[PDB]
Amino acid sequence: FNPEPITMANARYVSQDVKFENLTNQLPPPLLN
Amino acid sequence: FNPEPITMANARYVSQDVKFENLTNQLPPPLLN
Numbered sequence: 679f680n681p682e683p684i685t686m687a688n689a690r691y692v693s694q695d696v697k698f699e700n701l702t703n704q705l706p707p708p709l710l711n
Numbered sequence: 712f713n714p715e716p717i718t719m720a721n722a723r724y725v726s727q728d729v730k731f732e733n734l735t736n737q738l739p740p741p742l743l744n
């Protein structure tokens with residue numbers, strides 16, 4: 679257990695899913711335009 | 712053995728490490744902003 683910032687080093691792009699959280703604040707850089 | 716240019720087709724983003732090289736010149740295209 680070690681909380682780290684979310685980047686493309688540990689995230690991958692996937693398709694839309696209804697279990698996925700819908701974020702409008704503090705978007706991680708992968709999810710930020 | 713066949714040296715080819717470094718691109719995103721053969722490189723993946725990883726987290727910071729102390730044994731990684733520190734590049735300031737001729738940065739590969741994945742490492743330019």
Ligand SMILES: *[C@@H]1O[C@H](CO)[C@@H](O)[C@H](O)[C@H]1NC(C)=O
Binds near residue numbers: 695697698699700
């Ligand atoms: C996120 O959005 C999808 C599509 O609107 C919705 O089905 C789902 O209930 C929402 N909530 C979360 C956080 O899963």
Ligand SMILES: *[C@@H]1O[C@H](CO)[C@@H](O)[C@H](O)[C@H]1NC(C)=O
Binds near residue numbers: 728729730732
């Ligand atoms: C790269 O730079 C960092 C300082 O941010 C240093 O800790 C590390 O040893 C350097 N790596 C090499 C192999 O030069």
